[PDB]
Amino acid sequence: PRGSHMNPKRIRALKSGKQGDGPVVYWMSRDQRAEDNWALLFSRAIAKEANVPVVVVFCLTDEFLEAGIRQYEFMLKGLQELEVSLSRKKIPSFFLRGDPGEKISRFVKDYNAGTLVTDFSPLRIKNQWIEKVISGISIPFFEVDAHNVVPCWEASQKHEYAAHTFRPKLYALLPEFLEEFPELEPNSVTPETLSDVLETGVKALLPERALLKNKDPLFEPWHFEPGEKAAKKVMESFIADRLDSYGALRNDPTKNMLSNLSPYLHFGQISSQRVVLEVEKAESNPGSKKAFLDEILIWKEISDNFCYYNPGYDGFESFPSWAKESLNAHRNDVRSHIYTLEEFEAGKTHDPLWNASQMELLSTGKMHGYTRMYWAKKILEWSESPEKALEIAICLNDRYELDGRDPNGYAGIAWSIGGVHDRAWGEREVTGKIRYMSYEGCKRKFDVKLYIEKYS
DNA sequence: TCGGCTTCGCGCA
DNA sequence: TGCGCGAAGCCGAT
Numbered sequence: 412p413r414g415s416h417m418n419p420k421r422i423r424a425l426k427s428g429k430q431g432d433g434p435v436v437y438w439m440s441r442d443q444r445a446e447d448n449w450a451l452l453f454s455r456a457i458a459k460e461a462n463v464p465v466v467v468v469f470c471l472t473d474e475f476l477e478a479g480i481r482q483y484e485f486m487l488k489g490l491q492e493l494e495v496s497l498s499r500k501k502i503p504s505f506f507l508r509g510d511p512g513e514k515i516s517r518f519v520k521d522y523n524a525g526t527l528v529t530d531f532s533p534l535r536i537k538n539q540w541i542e543k544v545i546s547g548i549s550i551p552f553f554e555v556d557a558h559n560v561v562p563c564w565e566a567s568q569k570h571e572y573a574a575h576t577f578r579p580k581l582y583a584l585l586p587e588f589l590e591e592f593p594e595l596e597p598n599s600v601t602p603e604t605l606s607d608v609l610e611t612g613v614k615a616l617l618p619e620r621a622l623l624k625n626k627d628p629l630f631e632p633w634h635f636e637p638g639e640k641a642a643k644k645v646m647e648s649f650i651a652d653r654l655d656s657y658g659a660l661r662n663d664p665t666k667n668m669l670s671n672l673s674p675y676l677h678f679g680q681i682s683s684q685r686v687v688l689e690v691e692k693a694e695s696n697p698g699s700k701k702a703f704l705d706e707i708l709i710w711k712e713i714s715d716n717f718c719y720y721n722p723g724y725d726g727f728e729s730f731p732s733w734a735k736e737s738l739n740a741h742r743n744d745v746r747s748h749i750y751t752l753e754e755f756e757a758g759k760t761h762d763p764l765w766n767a768s769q770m771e772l773l774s775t776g777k778m779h780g781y782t783r784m785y786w787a788k789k790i791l792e793w794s795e796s797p798e799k800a801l802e803i804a805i806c807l808n809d810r811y812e813l814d815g816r817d818p819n820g821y822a823g824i825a826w827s828i829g830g831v832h833d834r835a836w837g838e839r840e841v842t843g844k845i846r847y848m849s850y851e852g853c854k855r856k857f858d859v860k861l862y863i864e865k866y867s
Numbered sequence: 868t869c870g871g872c873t874t875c876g877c878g879c880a
Numbered sequence: 881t882g883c884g885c886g887a888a889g890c891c892g893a894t
């Protein structure tokens with residue numbers, strides 16, 4: 412569909428049809444940004460070829476009721492900033508409320524749209540909406556991967572067992588799919604309040620707020636400023652100050668040596684391709700660049716691969732055969748501790764290290780990457796069943812992580828509990844052959860006491 | 868039919 | 881802290 416700096420492998424057709432004489436509609440769901448967005452860039456190119464304007468539509472669903480105010484405010488503030496950014500480029504943005512399968516189909520007919528484009532997400536609920544829209548529209552429907560550097564359907568045609576099998580496939584396609592982004596051209600032709608939906612949503616989620624003993628909210632909203640501009644500042648400071656020591660200190664939660672980009676990456680407020688572009692050009696420690704590029708390229712995009720080819724990604728069925736046989740054999744082992752969902756959520760376990768990891772999650776909304784493995788693994792050790800641990804870990808991860816409800820969350824929890832993208836280890840009680848992590852193992856790798864005291 | 872597995876624990880400089 | 885080894889099942893290059 413036209414374009415010079417435009418790889419057609421990034422786009423794929425979801426429904427054929429006659430191209431109408433109306434504007435091109437970019438159904439924005441996962442990549443909530445204006446810059447470095449192929450889906451918006453593909454939409455603009457199609458609109459330019461048909462001499463029609465491009466418009467952006469965003470449907471706010473009832474899914475926010477399953478999470479907290481921390482995610483709702485982070486997303487909505489960025490949407491307000493994005494609204495002004497698209498206005499400066501003469502691109503109007505429409506915000507609907509309701510079921511996307513019903514609202515997008517009504518919007519496509521009332522607005523007389525000619526072409527429908529959306530960004531890619533391997534989540535189950537995104538696929539259900541697409542099927543409902545396909546059955547309710549008669550215009551062409553395209554789908555652009557704006558979240559991965561190499562399109563998810565292109566990087567592999569099957570579920571990848573581990574990273575060392577997916578790594579050569581991804582890095583071979585980098586010289587083709589790693590490139591600069593063209594500027595978003597403004598519109599030539601021109602043709603609900605987000606402040607009201609913020610107040611309405613906040614009031615709804617107020618009774619479910621995480622509070623301390625004295626009714627004070629646990630969440631500290633100053634650690635991450637939401638928005639496209641604020642995302643770029645974080646990436647700049649990571650390259651300048653932290654990328655040099657990332658390789659040595661990534662597994663030390665006492666040092667803030669991570670990139671902190673996951674909240675922005677999840678909501679799409681910054682493109683992972685942009686970060687990789689800048690990281691590649693940066694002159695820093697060769698070991699740290701390789702370690703960082705491995706996380707944001709290999710392990711990020713294999714989480715999309717995991718969820719795209721396994722629709723039961725959030726279930727015990729998705730675990731490999733050896734892990735399922737190992738976890739089943741130990742179902743009758745006596746657990747040294749059994750905690751309920753309520754006890755885990757309030758950080759009332761016997762392990763001060765686990766409790767502190769939970770307190771980082773409750774208060775900041777971003778648990779450290781190393782402690783997240785220890786966090787989910789201990790849930791498996793102190794729960795009734797592998798199913799209950801998966802359910803509890805997914806519940807606490809989506810409710811409280813800013814980067815939650817993400818394919819990284821499900822694949823990461825799958826790695827911790829079911830050994831997805833991992834291998835077998837020493838046979839143990841309860842967890843079987845799943846990789847084990849101990850408090851004493853953390854003590855020799857980082858100052859565990861300093862971490863505990865920072866979060867009570 | 869081997870070789871090596873993100874993110875392991877453990878003994879030893 | 882940094883390093884080598886143990887302990888485990890399997891993909892994939894042949």
Ligand SMILES: Cc1cc2nc3c(=O)[nH]c(=O)nc-3n(C[C@H](O)[C@H](O)[C@H](O)COP(=O)(O)OP(=O)(O)OC[C@H]3O[C@@H](n4cnc5c(N)ncnc54)[C@H](O)[C@@H]3O)c2cc1C
Binds near residue numbers: 781809
């Ligand atoms: C049990 C568990 C739950 C997690 N929950 C989430 C989640 O809800 N949402 C989320 O985005 N990530 C989650 N992570 C993945 C990973 O821990 C986060 O990407 C990271 O901790 C966020 O901090 P950062 O962006 O500064 O990390 P960095 O070290 O700076 O990583 C750079 C980027 O690489 C990607 N990445 C890094 N580590 C991983 C990983 N292990 N798996 C997949 N991608 C990775 C992310 O996009 C991340 O932003 C989870 C991991 C585990 C083990």
